[PDB]
Nucleic acid binder design. Structure first.
Lengths: 189, 53, 63, 84
RNA sequence: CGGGGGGAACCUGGGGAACUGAAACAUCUCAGUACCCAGAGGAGAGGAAAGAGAAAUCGACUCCCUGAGUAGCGGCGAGCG
RNA sequence: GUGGUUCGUGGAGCCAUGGGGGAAUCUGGGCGGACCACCGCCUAAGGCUAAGUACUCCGGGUGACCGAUAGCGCACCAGU
RNA sequence: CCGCAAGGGGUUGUGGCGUGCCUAUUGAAGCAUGAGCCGGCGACUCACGGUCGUGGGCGAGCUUAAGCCGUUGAGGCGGAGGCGUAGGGAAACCGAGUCCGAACAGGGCGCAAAGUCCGCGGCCGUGGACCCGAAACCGGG
RNA sequence: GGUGGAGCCUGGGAGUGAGGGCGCGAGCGAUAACGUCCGCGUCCGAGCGCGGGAACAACCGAGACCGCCAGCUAAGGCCCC
RNA sequence: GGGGAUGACCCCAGGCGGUAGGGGAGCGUUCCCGAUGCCGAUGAAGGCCGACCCGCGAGGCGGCUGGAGGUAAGGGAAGUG
């Protein structure tokens, strides 16, 4: 239904069954996770400092008790194993499904192709005057085969493309504008 | 089993060659060479079985 | 990674999807037993319960 | 009871009601009079009997169960690989 | 004319081990691991076939995934693979 | 009589050799795992060959890494 | 003494009843151990396997290595493979039948009830893998 | 069957794998031991924490979710503390 | 178990000592989100004291301290008590 075509006064297009549907949160979140998940990095506590030196665990009989664990500045105990497989690879079908129902959630705004031409960030200022809002504040930049140039850098920069943009991209609580071949992304969908 | 050169020696028989055989334990005890009884090789059925081995 | 006392996997040891397993009768024979005939009538398959668990398990993966 | 090493021969589990059905799907291609040898769930084409042969098709496969081939007779035709 | 003397860790070759697991321990495993050595480098390794495999098929050597924890080695025991 | 190999002496080969024998140059000669016949494969018993993987003294970045009893043990007249 | 007043605050004379605390113990004040005081360090985790529970995406389901895309730097495409799709056998091989055997007697199975990937979780195998704790063997010096 | 509420199978996650104390029936054992050995009930488990029998797990009563200025009883007590 | 609106309320049944140990459910701790989240020189934090909240592990809050922060109404993470 209400798939509003930019260039305001200008026409209307239709919301497809795909986005239409009803929504899958557990999954959405899943998507998210998938995201930061494979992105993070990793950490560690010196193998050397931790099991390096020569420890003389003072025999016995003498009034004491024993390079090992539990005295100080060393040992670690079960540290930021630089040795810990950080990845998290969700799963293709899972994921894309995600970008999917999520985007549905987004439908809850229609970049009229012509726009792939506008050549100036002040021009942005312009389309902006055209439809500003807090949702606007959300603001996500989407072109459809190779970016809407200038559009790409402003108090909200970013520019995904008709192929290669995803929940990571914006399912994240935001609001936006994808260019029609971006609806080609639709195709992907 | 427990190879005993005692009056207890293992032995088996044949079906005229009904082919193979079947399981028996025996005693020099009485009757030496002696050893005849009948059976059923996979060969047909029955047959003369001599037991010596 | 992983494995099976590939051994018991091989001598005795196989699973029917039921998630159960069998091995050979094994009650005597194949060593001593001047013993008998009808007893020989004793070597088709044996199905040990519960324990067919360390069993199954340790084999897990292939068989 | 296993071997001193490798070798191994082959053939494989494919079948009757199985093909009449998911093959019903197979209709996307050689599923008219049928010319069979999918490429969508198996590896080395034998066909188990059971079910009730249908769809009138001929198979370029390896072979099929007793019942198999027979009901096959019931509603189609047989075609065995390289040389049989 | 060239050498050698270095060098944290990496490479290859020379030499080359007990604990520990097998709930002992002689096979075995720890390993061709640790170490010591000679030496080349910036990377060495290796590298166009007395190969592969067998569909009359493939064609450097290496390195990832996969093949297989399969094919299998074995006081067929731990395990190794 | 040993090695590698997945092979622990094994039905047990290929290559590599310790010690003795000590061939053939294209109908040559090994090879496909004992061996034998036929086939299929390769052409040894000289050499060079950047790139595709490793590594970190050193330079850069970055971190759901640290905050001085934690980080390399040493953030500064410390391997002293 | 009443900065939350006819109720509490602190202190206690008397009186009642009353054996510390932790380990390991048939059994514990303990005269068995542990520990003199206060402050900071300090011990069931990670990884890959596998496993059963479940949250959820299709039931055939699912992903490598990579190639490309990358303030944010965006994921996408990769279809060797591997787990369900019948299995019975040692095998030949047959096959929803199948082994034994030559007998219609039994064992395995058929019977879809179908998985499958991913997520988090009780657990198991290999890992130094709840933490420190000795004698000692071995290597080079 | 008055009962009421345990009963059974399937599967994941467990601990302890050595106790003792009493009554009773056997052993042994000097019918000796706060001995031990099995057995039948309970007991106790570092809290089966209260009562008592002085004091005393632990033997008789008794099951402790929590209510200071309530009441009926156990066993056990009622000259005094 | 008898309705439950989301609470909650009501009746009774119905117990509720508990170590190894098995199941549910909460608490604060320094981190990553600032899921159309930002307080603070008239104080961030930590400190110092307290006769409102919680069963509680904690909250709040008011007073004095001290110089600069850092919170997150919610999920994620772990060198956590």
């Amino acid at each position: 239904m209400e798939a509003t075509i930019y260039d305001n006064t200008d026409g209307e297009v239709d919301l497809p069954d795909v986005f239409e549907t009803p929504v899958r949160s557990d999954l959405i979140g899943k998507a998210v996770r998938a995201a930061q998940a494979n992105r993070k990095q990793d950490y560690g506590s010196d193998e050397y400092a931790g099991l390096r030196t020569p420890a003389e665990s003072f025999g016995s009989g003498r009034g004491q008790a024993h390079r090992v664990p539990q005295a100080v500045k060393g040992r670690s105990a079960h540290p930021p194993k630089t040795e810990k497989d950080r990845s998290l690879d969700l799963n293709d079908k899972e994921r894309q499904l995600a970008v999917r129902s999520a985007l549905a959630a987004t439908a809850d705004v229609v970049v009229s192709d012509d726009f792939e031409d506008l050549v100036k960030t002040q021009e942005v200022v312009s389309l902006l005057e055209a439809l500003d809002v807090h949702a606007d504040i959300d603001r996500l930049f989407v072109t459809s085969d190779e970016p809407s140039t200038a559009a790409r850098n402003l108090a909200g920069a970013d520019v995904a493309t008709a192929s290669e943009v995803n929940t990571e991209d914006l399912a994240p609580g935001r609001l936006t504008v994808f260019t029609e071949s971006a609806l080609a992304e639709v195709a992907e969908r | 089993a427990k190879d005993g050169p005692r009056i207890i020696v293992k032995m088996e028989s044949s079906a005229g060659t009904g082919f193979y055989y079947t399981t028996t334990k025996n005693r020099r005890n009485t009757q030496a060479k002696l050893e005849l009884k009948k059976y059923d090789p996979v060969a047909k059925k029955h047959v003369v079985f001599r037991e010596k081995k | 990674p992983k494995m099976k006392t590939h051994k018991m996997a091989k001598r005795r040891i196989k699973i029917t999807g039921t998630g159960k397993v069998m091995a050979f009768k094994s009650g005597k024979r194949h060593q001593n037993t001047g013993k008998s005939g009808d007893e020989i009538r004793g070597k088709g398959k044996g199905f040990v319960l519960a324990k067919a668990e360390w069993a199954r398990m340790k084999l897990m993966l292939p068989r | 009871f296993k071997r001193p090493q490798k070798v191994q021969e082959e053939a494989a589990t494919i079948d009757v009601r199985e093909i009449d059905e998911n093959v019903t799907l197979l209709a996307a291609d050689d599923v008219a009079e049928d010319v069979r040898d999918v490429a969508d769930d198996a590896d080395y084409v034998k066909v188990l009997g059971a079910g009730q042969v249908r769809h009138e098709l001929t198979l370029i496969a390896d072979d099929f169960s007793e019942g198999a081939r027979e009901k096959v007779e019931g509603a189609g035709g047989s075609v065995e690989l390289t040389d049989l």
